[PDB]
Amino acid sequence: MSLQMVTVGHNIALIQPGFSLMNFDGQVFFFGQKGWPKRSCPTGVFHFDIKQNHLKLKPAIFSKDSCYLPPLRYPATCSYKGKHQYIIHGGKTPNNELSDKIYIMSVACKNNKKVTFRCTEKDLVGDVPEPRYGHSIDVVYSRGKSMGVLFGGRSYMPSTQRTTEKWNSVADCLPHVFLIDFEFGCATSYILPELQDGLSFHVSIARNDTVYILGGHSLASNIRPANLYRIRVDLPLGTPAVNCTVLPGGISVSSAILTQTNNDEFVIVGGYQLENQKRMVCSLVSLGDNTIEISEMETPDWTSDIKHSKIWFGSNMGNGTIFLGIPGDNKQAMSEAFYFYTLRCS
Amino acid sequence: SDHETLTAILSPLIAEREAMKSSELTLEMGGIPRTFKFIFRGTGYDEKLVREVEGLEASGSVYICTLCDTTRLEASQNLVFHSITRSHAENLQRYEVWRSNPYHESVEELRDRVKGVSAKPFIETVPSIDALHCDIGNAAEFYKIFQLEIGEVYKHPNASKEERKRWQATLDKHLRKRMNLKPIMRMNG
Amino acid sequence: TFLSCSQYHKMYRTVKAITGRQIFQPLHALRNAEKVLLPGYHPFEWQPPLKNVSSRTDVGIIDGLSGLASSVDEYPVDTIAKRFRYDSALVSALM
Ligand SMILES: [Zn+2]
Numbered sequence: 245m246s247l248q249m250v251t252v253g254h255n256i257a258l259i260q261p262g263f264s265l266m267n268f269d270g271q272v273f274f275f276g277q278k279g280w281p282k283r284s285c286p287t288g289v290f291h292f293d294i295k296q297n298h299l300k301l302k303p304a305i306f307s308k309d310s311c312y313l314p315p316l317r318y319p320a321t322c323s324y325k326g327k328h329q330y331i332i333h334g335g336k337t338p339n340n341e342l343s344d345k346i347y348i349m350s351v352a353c354k355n356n357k358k359v360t361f362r363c364t365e366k367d368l369v370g371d372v373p374e375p376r377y378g379h380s381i382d383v384v385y386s387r388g389k390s391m392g393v394l395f396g397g398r399s400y401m402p403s404t405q406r407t408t409e410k411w412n413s414v415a416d417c418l419p420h421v422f423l424i425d426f427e428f429g430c431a432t433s434y435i436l437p438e439l440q441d442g443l444s445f446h447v448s449i450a451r452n453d454t455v456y457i458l459g460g461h462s463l464a465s466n467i468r469p470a471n472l473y474r475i476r477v478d479l480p481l482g483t484p485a486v487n488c489t490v491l492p493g494g495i496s497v498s499s500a501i502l503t504q505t506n507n508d509e510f511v512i513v514g515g516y517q518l519e520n521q522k523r524m525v526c527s528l529v530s531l532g533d534n535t536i537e538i539s540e541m542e543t544p545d546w547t548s549d550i551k552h553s554k555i556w557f558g559s560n561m562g563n564g565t566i567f568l569g570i571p572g573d574n575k576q577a578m579s580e581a582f583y584f585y586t587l588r589c590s
Numbered sequence: 591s592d593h594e595t596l597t598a599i600l601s602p603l604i605a606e607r608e609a610m611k612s613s614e615l616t617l618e619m620g621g622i623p624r625t626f627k628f629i630f631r632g633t634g635y636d637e638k639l640v641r642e643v644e645g646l647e648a649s650g651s652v653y654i655c656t657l658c659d660t661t662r663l664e665a666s667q668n669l670v671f672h673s674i675t676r677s678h679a680e681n682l683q684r685y686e687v688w689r690s691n692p693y694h695e696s697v698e699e700l701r702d703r704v705k706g707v708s709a710k711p712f713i714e715t716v717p718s719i720d721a722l723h724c725d726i727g728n729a730a731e732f733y734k735i736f737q738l739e740i741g742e743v744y745k746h747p748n749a750s751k752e753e754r755k756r757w758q759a760t761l762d763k764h765l766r767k768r769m770n771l772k773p774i775m776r777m778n779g
Numbered sequence: 780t781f782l783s784c785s786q787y788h789k790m791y792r793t794v795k796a797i798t799g800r801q802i803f804q805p806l807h808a809l810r811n812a813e814k815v816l817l818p819g820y821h822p823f824e825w826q827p828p829l830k831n832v833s834s835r836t837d838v839g840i841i842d843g844l845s846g847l848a849s850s851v852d853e854y855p856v857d858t859i860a861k862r863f864r865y866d867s868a869l870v871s872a873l874m
Contacts, residue, residue, distance in 0.1 A: 260594075260854075262854065280593065280708065280709035281709075283651075286697050306696075308696055310691065311691055312691055312697075312700075317854065318854075336854075339597045339710055340597050365690075408605050409841050413845075413846035413847075414848055444852075445852050519850065519851060520851075555855060594854075598847055599844065599858075599862075602845045602862075606864060606866060610825070610869075613829060615823060615825055616823070616824055617822075619873075
């Protein structure tokens with residue numbers, strides 16, 4: 245509940261909706277710039293530091309064997325904390341294609357506070373999921389092993405039903421649950437009858453043996469359901485086993501942003517309530533060993549713009565710090581392209 | 591320059607164009623049906639648009655030619671002996687080389703290896719030169735060499751940027767005096 | 780000549796009124812003779828049929844965004860675009 249306005253550098257224009265903020269050891273990094281990578285920064289990933297509410301998008305370099313990657317506009321990202329690394333799946337390259345690669349991003353070396361990433365390309369073998377965006381991925385541990393759960397999002401029509409009067413129409417992918425092994429690149433689908441409708445832009449929390457799926461949009465009936473789901477996974481020495489459950493007391497949100505304010509307690513901020521109604525309230529969720537609860541916190545102060553605008557976007561910075569953006573008026577005294585804001589909860 | 595919107599609109603047209611390159615259109619032409627087969631050449635692009643959608647570095651690069659692969663420090667020594675070796679599929683596989691990075695080397699020599707290709711090209715275009723913007727560019731270039739030769743730089747170089755506005759003024763004043771050519775900022779054809 | 784569709788009516792009605800016999804046709808028989816020259820009027824067929832392209836023969840002006848979804852949850856768009864299909868443009872441009 246601490247809002248602040250942020251001044252920007254000169255290359256403000258490299259922020260589009262759907263970036264990703266990779267957080268390494270307190271340092272914050274920007275991914276998903278607008279347009280293909282220029283010659284000011286040939287990699288397309290930015291060092292993103294903010295001092296005195298003034299931020300500086302500095303370049304970053306790669307390793308000797310890294311895989312130079314396209315700027316994805318809506319991927320799924322997860323924090324695989326086993327060295328620390330990030331996992332990027334899917335997304336939407338600026339030629340409006342969709343990718344189906346796994347990008348593994350870690351730090352090679354950091355000298356003189358100047359980082360040097362590396363990123364490798366892992367391609368799944370087996371029951372590979374179809375390329376999509378807006379989905380979610382989460383790494384979960386059990387019995388000394390780790391698997392990446394993946395719940396699907398929306399995508400294009402398959403390559404036989406695409407007509408070029410409706411070439412750019414999207415439909416939700418089939419609501420299975422994919423399980424991914426990273427060390428060998430394996431995939432496994434799981435069909436389960438408790439998940440019926442397609443879901444996109446939902447929120448996914450991962451507490452140490454189970455993943456909670458909350459909110460989301462469903463394109464089959466253009467409704468935003470309120471029902472959350474709990475997914476329990478265990479991999480034995482044999483084949484892994486997945487279970488779902490519908491728990492009561494959820495909420496209806498889509499494209500919300502959720503971060504970790506304390507140990508085992510998360511907070512979620514404004515996505516969208518209805519197709520015209522933004523969500524100004526915020527909700528704190530309290531985790532546990534087996535039980536959670538969702539309560540509403542004290543609905544913080546908004547400025548004239550964030551009360552008055554039509555859309556927003558943003559993500560979290562890592563230390564409980566939400567980055568947000570606002571379009572801003574065009575019919576004005578030549579107002580800027582975007583306004584930016586920082587929310588703190590400490 | 592809004593690259594995502596431009597690809598979002600021009601993608602179905604390239605889908606239809608790539609469809610109708612292996613087909614025959616049968617259609618009546620005055621009674622009896624006739625059969626048509628098409629050959630597409632995409633040529634009418636200016637230098638900025640042909641540099642963007644074919645996936646090159648921008649026009650102020652170290653790499654100048656959309657048709658060949660020589661730097662501008664290689665042009666001024668061998669002026670006329672070049673060839674034409676920038677196709678479309680070659681640029682597509684060079685982007686694939688840039689994305690994969692299979693030889694495990696840094697950006698400063700990977701960019702030299704792929705000859706400045708740093709995006710995915712998405713329109714099949716043929717390499718050619720224009721005719722309009724070429725003539726306007728040559729016009730402005732030796733107009734600038736006229737303004738240079740007034741100030742006699744071959745005797746002594748590097749006068750500062752206060753002689754030059756006087757050189758411009760004496761040039762267009764003299765040429766308006768003789769030819770009645772009004773001084774125009776944006777040069778036309 | 781870049782007349783409007785309301786000034787043509789002026790010229791037509793007073794030419795017909797002054798010289799009695801009409802020389803310019805009315806607006807409706809003009810628009811009925813417009814539909815021959817646009818795309819989306821003639822039968823045609825491809826051999827082999829086109830992959831990913833519809834097989835109908837009678838579509839004229841489509842939305843150029845190609846069903847690109849504009850919901851608040853997705854990437855924002857505000858452009859307007861129109862287009863023909865490519866094949867049905869070449870058919871009328873040949874005939
Ligand atoms: Zn050349």
